[PDB]
Amino acid sequence: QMLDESARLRLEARGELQALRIQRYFMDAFQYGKGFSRQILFLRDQAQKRFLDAYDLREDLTRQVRTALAANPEVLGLYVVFEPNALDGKDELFVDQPALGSNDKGRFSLYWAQATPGQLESESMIESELADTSSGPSGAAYNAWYTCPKESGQPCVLDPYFDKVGERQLLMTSIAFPLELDGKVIGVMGLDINLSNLQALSEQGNRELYDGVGQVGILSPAGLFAGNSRDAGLLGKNLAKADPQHAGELLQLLAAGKSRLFNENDDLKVLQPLQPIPGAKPWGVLLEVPKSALLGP
Ligand SMILES: NCCc1c[nH]cn1
């Protein structure tokens, strides 16, 4: 039977298409963040060249972070952190100025968030929070949304982790940017993305995939579910919870950016890795569809 080969090719292509969809979602947010970081660095340069004073600058940044978050209802939070005195050399003047995005040490450390689109509240991140290395569900340090682009000089897409919005703990990922001046990192900017958005993405793609007869899952590099059309209760959970026998193999395939098909009863599984942004560690889509659907009516 040459039936099995056509079923494999179809699912491989479906796996590729689903990865394109997830990649586009991440890349749209990456575009938006990259464009806004230029606005941040320009304002910083206007103040460095004394065309703009520090009080107006910190006010301007604080307002424009909020406006840029309000403009993208796909984004959960927007944070901006500068190294000490690296925004304007004037941190000492803004100690405990949260209405100007300045924290307990005057460092410009600003967050705007919208738990639902439009309920914009703000926080100035204190030093102990910027330095909190507590391990999360993936093993990664809590403050990787700050230290990751600062250490590499490159953007990062964190594994799912819990963070505070309002006074609730939400499960999320972030696209975090280094703010570089002449090849040196002077600060960090980042977009927070509610994992419920990726859960919706995996459900919507499953509906378009043979009328939802199978399932679509989204895997972060560390192997946490960022989306699972069959059970949202798997958000933030390790792949071994749903796929113990192949968890280990699936994760090394993922990290090596290798695709693979799996035969199981009369169902097919495909793991399709994907880079969410350029150079990022591969995420993946896991697709399972019964063979009878692939060789459909
Ligand atoms: N969500 C990562 C940025 C942040 C703001 N407040 C706490 N953490």
Residue numbers in the entry: 48 to 344
Which sentences from the paper describe this structure?
This chemotactic response is mediated by the concerted action of the TlpQ, PctA, and PctC chemoreceptors, which display differing sensitivities to histamine. TlpQ is the first bacterial histamine receptor to be described and greatly differs from human histamine receptors, indicating that eukaryotes and bacteria have pursued different strategies for histamine recognition.
To determine the molecular determinants for histamine recognition by TlpQ, we solved the high-resolution structure of TlpQ-LBD in complex with histamine. The membrane-distal module contained bound histamine in all four monomers of the asymmetric unit. Of all the homologous domains that we identified, TlpQ-LBD was the largest, at 334 amino acids, namely due to particularly long inserts between β-strands 1 and 2, extended helices α1 and α2, and an extended loop between helices η3 and α3. In addition, this histamine amino group interacts with a water molecule coordinated by the main chain oxygen of Lys211 and the hydroxyl group of Tyr158. Each of the histamine imidazole nitrogen atoms forms hydrogen bonds with Asp210 and Glu170.
